[PDB]
Nucleic acid binder design. Sequence first.
DNA 1: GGGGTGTGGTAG
DNA 2: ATCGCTACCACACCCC
Length: 433
Amino acid sequence: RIVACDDPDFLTSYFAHSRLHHLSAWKANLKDKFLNENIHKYTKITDKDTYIIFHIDFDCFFATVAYLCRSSSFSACDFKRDPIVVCHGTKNSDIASCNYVARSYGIKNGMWVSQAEKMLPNGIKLISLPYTFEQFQLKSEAFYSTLKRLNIFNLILPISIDEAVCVRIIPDNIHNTNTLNARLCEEIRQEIFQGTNGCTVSIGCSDSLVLARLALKMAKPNGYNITFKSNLSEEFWSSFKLDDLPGVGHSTLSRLESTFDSPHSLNDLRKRYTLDALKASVGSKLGMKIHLALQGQDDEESLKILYDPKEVLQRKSLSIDINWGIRFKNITQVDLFIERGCQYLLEKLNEINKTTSQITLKLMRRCKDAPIEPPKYMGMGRCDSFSRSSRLGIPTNEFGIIATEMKSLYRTLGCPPMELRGLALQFNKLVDV
DNA sequence: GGGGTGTGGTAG
DNA sequence: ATCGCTACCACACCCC
Ligand SMILES: Nc1ccn([C@H]2C[C@H](O)[C@@H](COP(=O)(O)OP(=O)(O)OP(=O)(O)O)O2)c(=O)n1
Ligand SMILES: *[C@H]1c2c(cc3ccc4cccc5ccc2c3c45)[C@@H](O)[C@H](O)[C@@H]1O
Ligand SMILES: [Mg+2]
Ligand SMILES: [Mg+2]
Ligand SMILES: [Mg+2]
Ligand SMILES: [Mg+2]
């Protein structure tokens, strides 16, 4: 029934179930597809061009598709009336996606099922649907195909399985730009709904990447929003949390909330901040990025994907990360796992016709004062992260060289097998042919 | 007195 | 039970 981490089937089984594995693998495939489809198309934007960004994503993607494709066992439930989540388990299992009914009760993606169940009023039951991974891929394919078929974008950039940044180069100062672009948003939404047999998308439309992303958030669910730099207002900025900004996650949020005393929205932040205080709080680069974002402007790093997508989407490293289900008794089993992981990576490296000249082993070790078993079944729990890299010299795809050095890096780090809670094996530098 | 490594962080 | 991946950016430290 259960495949343990010392079983040869473990990696196959874990990756077959892991939604985060699928997200990353799908993204890697989409980047490759982009490169292959545009090998003769030399399209890119310059700092002289005027353009409009359409940032397009599916509403509650896994929930929508899992519902549409649900087994006969779930015939009864109603996507507009019932709170619906996609997950594996029944207690401390991540909600991959939840529908907007579930969200009306305060349920959010990434919440455990056990937290979610508490938020429902008595009587109302949470509906848990299984993942339909294959069908997520087919719906994505129909999405990307529709975007291309419309023949309206100069550039279509894959962000994720359910999300694309689509660029139209346009003349500066078009008359009736808001109406003309609204019509495009309406057409796009209709075509994708038809082309995916009933999945909805939202669209954020602007003249910068950062504003198009924010506009998309404002549009959800099942809508569009057009907010150009010239349309910015306090009311717009009042609608966004600080971590709605790209590059602001949980850690950066914590720092900003401390420095600026818990602003409730981007408008509150806009009113309190200085560039110097930002940089002191979150560092020079991120500080500048945020400052620019609060003016509706993109930083230069973010713009690289417009100016040279082929360079940006090129793969520069290859790794696996397993930080769930890792429970080893001894070093013999750790070594066998490292060997299997190295072969998995070599099969991928060989499939993309590359070699590697540098590797890294990263591990998660149980914190001294953390419980031996965490609350989440097979979770890593609270850990310290340690890593060591090695240059191999000449670029290679030889198992003997790579795997031997990986096992050696494990020994240098000195983690007792019973304290190990996660492992990452990385090929950091790749060379073609 | 500039750069390589380990560490921390972000996005779906 | 439950499936906490993975590419890529940033930067503090520490070298002699
Ligand atoms: N930590 C994450 C992030 C995303 N996903 C998966 C499930 C989501 O359905 C899909 C797309 O991610 P989004 O962040 O776009 O979330 P949704 O599409 O579910 O909702 P929204 O309507 O907010 O876009 O990726 C996941 O499993 N775990
Ligand atoms: C697991 C992990 C870590 C950090 C965080 C921080 C904030 C979180 C909020 C909500 C859910 C959640 C789940 C897993 C998390 C979270 C959060 C890291 O410290 C750890 O290494 C893992 O990524
Ligand atoms: Mg989204
Ligand atoms: Mg989505
Ligand atoms: Mg998305
Ligand atoms: Mg954010």
